[PDB]
Design a protein around this ligand. Sequence first.
Ligand SMILES: CC(=O)N[C@H]1[C@H]([C@H](O)[C@H](O)CO)O[C@](OP(=O)(O)OC[C@H]2O[C@@H](n3ccc(N)nc3=O)[C@H](O)[C@@H]2O)(C(=O)O)C[C@@H]1O
Ligand SMILES: CC(=O)N[C@H]1[C@H]([C@H](O)[C@H](O)CO)O[C@](OP(=O)(O)OC[C@H]2O[C@@H](n3ccc(N)nc3=O)[C@H](O)[C@@H]2O)(C(=O)O)C[C@@H]1O
Ligand SMILES: [Ca+2]
Ligand SMILES: [Ca+2]
Lengths: 225, 225
Amino acid sequence: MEKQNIAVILARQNSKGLPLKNLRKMNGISLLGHTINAAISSKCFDRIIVSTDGGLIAEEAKNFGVEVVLRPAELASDTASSISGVIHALETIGSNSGTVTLLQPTSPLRTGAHIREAFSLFDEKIKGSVVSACPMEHHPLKTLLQINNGEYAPMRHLSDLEQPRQQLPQAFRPNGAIYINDTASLIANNCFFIAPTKLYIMSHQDSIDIDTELDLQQAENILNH
Amino acid sequence: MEKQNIAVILARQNSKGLPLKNLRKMNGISLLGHTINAAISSKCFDRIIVSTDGGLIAEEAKNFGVEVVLRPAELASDTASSISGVIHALETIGSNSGTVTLLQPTSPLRTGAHIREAFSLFDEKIKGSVVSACPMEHHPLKTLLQINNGEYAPMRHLSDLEQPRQQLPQAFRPNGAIYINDTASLIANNCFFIAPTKLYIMSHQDSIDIDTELDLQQAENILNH
Ligand SMILES: CC(=O)N[C@H]1[C@H]([C@H](O)[C@H](O)CO)O[C@](OP(=O)(O)OC[C@H]2O[C@@H](n3ccc(N)nc3=O)[C@H](O)[C@@H]2O)(C(=O)O)C[C@@H]1O
Ligand SMILES: CC(=O)N[C@H]1[C@H]([C@H](O)[C@H](O)CO)O[C@](OP(=O)(O)OC[C@H]2O[C@@H](n3ccc(N)nc3=O)[C@H](O)[C@@H]2O)(C(=O)O)C[C@@H]1O
Ligand SMILES: [Ca+2]
Ligand SMILES: [Ca+2]
């Protein structure tokens, strides 16, 4: 096979929250369109695929000049895993060698430059994931986990709960915007986090994820800096 | 000595953020007053002390009918630890036996009922802390910690990052509203988290902490249910 860099944008029609979320407009452009534009402007991809079950989403993708994979209902339900959708897209276009990047439409402030910056961290020899991430608002060592009913244990040391944050290791969470993997590795492991995983760090501002109407408005306000 | 249940409300005059924050009004009552009212209505305390360096805060505390400890400047600076303020209050009134509870004015939706509910968890024989806490918005096992420059390691397992949250242990963070300790233990350990620490769980709504003008408005709106 030819090695290919593939972008997969999963955009199902039924959004369990905000209705028709993937086509909702932000500064005049659909969420889908913002992420398609990021994929194109990154110049990182040989193939850009929108995977959907919805006719309106498919028409939007075609109007932006990218490929469409149609998902049957069982891969677009509320319970369907993202990994099964990415696997189905790769099987449909016939790629099992190269890289595959998931780009969620719910991260509209993730730009093509962010994608290029993340790609520069990918190690073609070692082939761990590159995942975009942002700093944790509340430090995860300053937490306790339930071990029994009404019984809790510190995440690490009890003394961590009173340590100045600057004296603790820096902590990060995935923000959903970018997951880059070696294609054969993603197929074999059937997941998005493959060791050794590297992080591409983004600001809290650029990590906004759209769930609510107020999220859409905040993202618009951020664009209008 | 007589064993005493002491409440200490630390309320310094200089707020590094919102100016004069501890006297800012919320539905007509100062933040200080809301927490004093919680301490009184809990009926958990033999002594209620407001510790401050500020004349206006001291006058407000006296008007609510509680005791005042005056802190010298070195215990009320931007760098001064909360524990040193609680230790100084206990030394001033001469108590080293019983319980001591820190009640921060920045948690105005923490009520007297919350204080009673937390106190019911305190174990007078084993004498670990009781700390009020709320659920973590982002699960702390779904994080990575920096171990070297540009090198990160999962908090626990890499597979935790893709686990449904409901399949992970429940996680909680202190919310700042209540810290209950055995008095002799707090003096000896010079800290607020003493094993075995128990958690009193509060909702995200009741855990609001005041840092901004918008925080004050949100807390007011919550009160007006
Ligand atoms: C990679 C992955 O597991 N993605 C999941 C993400 C991820 O964990 C977070 O965003 C990280 O912060 O979480 C979810 O993210 P969510 O349900 O909002 O979906 C994000 C975007 O992906 C599309 N989608 C999702 C699943 C699927 N089978 N097909 C799809 O087309 C949606 O239409 C939307 O554009 C979640 O909220 O539960 C579910 C997603 O499946
Ligand atoms: C127990 C403890 O360590 N408290 C600290 C808390 C705590 O960790 C969080 O609230 C938990 O979510 O964090 C701080 O909390 P913060 O600075 O807002 O202070 C909270 C309240 O305590 C008063 N205060 C604080 C310290 C001190 N030496 N004297 C005081 O009178 C303030 O006037 C205000 O009413 C922080 O933001 O850094 C600093 C506080 O010292
Ligand atoms: Ca989501
Ligand atoms: Ca604070």
